[PDB]
């Protein structure tokens, strides 16, 4: 037994927001069917409801009540009665579950502070930063909000769940140099963990065809006082008469404030040397070559989960110069091992990923997502004849296979053998790659994560930069699956059918399989 | 052969691609007067000022098609797929917006072969192919000079390569030299495009917009070359007798105008007209070889292209809880006289009808723009082919809160 | 009986759980204060470094407090008393590091100097009698002056007088202290206004 006609609506208690705007946000008008959720769902459940409009703005000391009057005939008159309290200031932040990571590491990335006013956007951003940091599980995080109406303040509990990231190679992700050079109170036989710094070592010890050594270190908060970071690395490798390559680099990153606070700029300086005699898979055959390179990279990253992102984007724009010795600064097979004592180039790249959910998300968080890929590259030259023999692009297949060599950049193009579009004598000086992927996860958990996908791809590469043509591409489609392991990176299976011929031959097209490892 | 298989593309720069984004591709291509602020529109630079304050738009598209080709009693079909736009757009001030993107301008694709036998018993085979196209990369901006009025410009790099071959092969013959002439035209210059838009506040709920666009006549830096290959085979490259020529290439004056009516933000209708002054362009080459000269004068010749298009979209009751109330519904149709001149007379005449959707992503402002088209090209003289082409398109407008600050 | 063997091998978890399960199932088991106090020290000895999760330290505090009232007769009441004091000082040291972090970051995005003073004040109120009262007080004084420098021009004299109040409060609390020199330069800068 109930009435059915909305005759009037009314407001009492409001000061912070205009009454007509709340009429609009309540989405009601006189002369309409009387219901209850129609009011309630729009006042206490939905993300644009009035109650949330107060709650998310730090006014957590509130209540609300739909008053019904004039219950006559077909009709009810309605009045919104609400309470405006004092805007809540944060009193304390409690954080728990950090087995292997000092609070110093995490409290510096929070966006809320004790002593400032509460707001939903700051809290959500802080949880995004923690999720992206990766030292904790990106799932099953939720803050334990506890208000206090006597003092009118709120304290936030952050219960977190820990996971350890480590994998011949080693990927120590939370390794501290201060705890190495001066243990705090007891190293107790354990590695010097903490501070969120990371160390990594890798190499091949086959020694009868391949041999290599490498090391890298990254400090995300240099000096412990500002978000600017230090990165250093070095490497060395033999391959069978032999070919010798070694080098090192140093870089420096910085968060920006101009477009937004998601942009990060990075600058890096690098050195490499190549050492050869009677070698044959490069145009160079006998000598020693050097290169000094300065790189600027502008990037923006706004995704939620590193392992299976569901919203946001990842944009990067990069340029990499080496000084122009061909010009007046340096001035003055036939003679090709000549003039490349020092190599010359300027390499440009653009790289963008895009993620969107296709079925709401938040609810049934297993979800389903549509991905989008786009990347372009150019290896330009100051002088028409002194084109660089090193740093060229190599495209086709899994991409991982190219890291048997370190003087080229390997680019996966799925559905085409391996290194197929760029054979000997047709090294790539420009490339393009595009693709749609539709992905569904089977399982998302602390230890292991699984998802399956179908894809459309197109890509190409050119030996001559002046013939770059992003609308003439080799095209592919297929399906695949990937696995994330508790103590190893990705492993996955991709099948793809290459529709279009390469250099007039159909030999490399058709059905192909790719076996991805590590991470793309 | 990544955008077309129509053998009309043996003439001119190929066939011009319409850089019509997702909403316009379903709405028949009525892009001059449009101010749909949720999706990008490079066809009129004055349209950029409609973007919401904190947003960054990033959009690209894909097309799949099946072409039925008919002529002289023969019937065949060829099917293909393409990538056909990509752009970024963002706001710089309460009164200015900027965009950067990558667009096609024209494409070529044809293989048309043949096999024969003479009365003396010699069998021979011919093969006429073609590949490449012209492309455009642009940076543009639009500004508000008055509360009703916006103007803008696109400055574009404009480069490409069109290659066209003729062969003569003799299957079954033990040892011989094949003849093949490969005429190539590389182009690298710039292109300017200008536009303006004006909006009027009719009857307090509706609005009517008018737009115009213009681009001036231009002469292009180029590298036209006349290669003849002799003796190439499955094992050998043969010899190349190159020949470099002083050819002149151009772009014509182009004009376009249209309007769009809009009501209660639920309904929009509009129509466009455009004309391109191709017949007033001075293409030509200078050489001592008449065969080459004749070919140039017979392959680069044009007539005035005109286009007429109409379309609409409808978005019913977008505040009610049902997904089919959030879907943008689109329709359109268009008419074109292509610029092809074959023999002395005009070549073809084409018609098209289009329809599509505007699927929004919940809890986001991204839009997926599945759209479909049917286009018929009719040859105006008995020796030329007719085409029925079916096409379906996918396009995602990504849209995220980007320039926000505390 | 097993716990003392696990205690001698320094396997504090098994020692603790074999002690406690026995005096939970029956008020003294059959080993009485020895099992209780061995369990208390075993639970103490797993204590993390002062900036990890701290989960076992609150449990240790409450376990020792409940020991003091199950066996108030015990001579081990003292040995629990100084243990709960050591635990309280570690809990305060965690909050002290938090306040130091907010002072280190400073007037970066957000504010973080007002945060420092309220964090260390919360420390002073939540654990009144700790050793670290001197460090907490001088951190209040430094953060007070630091906020006074960077505040808006309508709202600086009040922060300066809050700073001088903290100066005189520090002298009242500690008539002599090793940290008075920097305090006195803070005073000489702020007393001008």
Residue numbers in the entry:
A (entry chain A): 291 to 457, 473 to 545, 590 to 681, 697 to 884
B (entry chain F): 23 to 428
C (entry chain D): 72 to 264
Quoted from the paper:
The β-barrel assembly machinery (BAM) complex is a conserved, multiprotein machine that mediates the folding and membrane insertion of newly synthesized β-barrel outer membrane (OM) proteins. Cryogenic electron microscopy (cryo-EM) structures of the BAM complexes from the gut commensal B. thetaiotaomicron and the oral pathogen Porphyromonas gingivalis are similar and reveal a 7-protein, ~325-kDa complex with most of its mass on the extracellular side.
Class 1 lacks density for the periplasmic components but has good density for all extracellular proteins, whereas class 2 has modest resolution for BamA POTRA domains 4 and 5 and for part of BamD, but with poorly resolved extracellular areas. A feature that clearly distinguishes BamG from FadL channels with a known transport role is an extension of the N-terminus of ~10 residues, which protrudes through the lateral opening in the barrel wall that normally is part of the FadL transport pathway. Density for BamA POTRA domains 1–3 and for the N-terminal region of BamD is missing (residues 18–71), and the visible periplasmic components have a relatively low resolution. There was no cryo-EM density observed for this 38-residue loop, which suggests that it samples a range of different conformations.
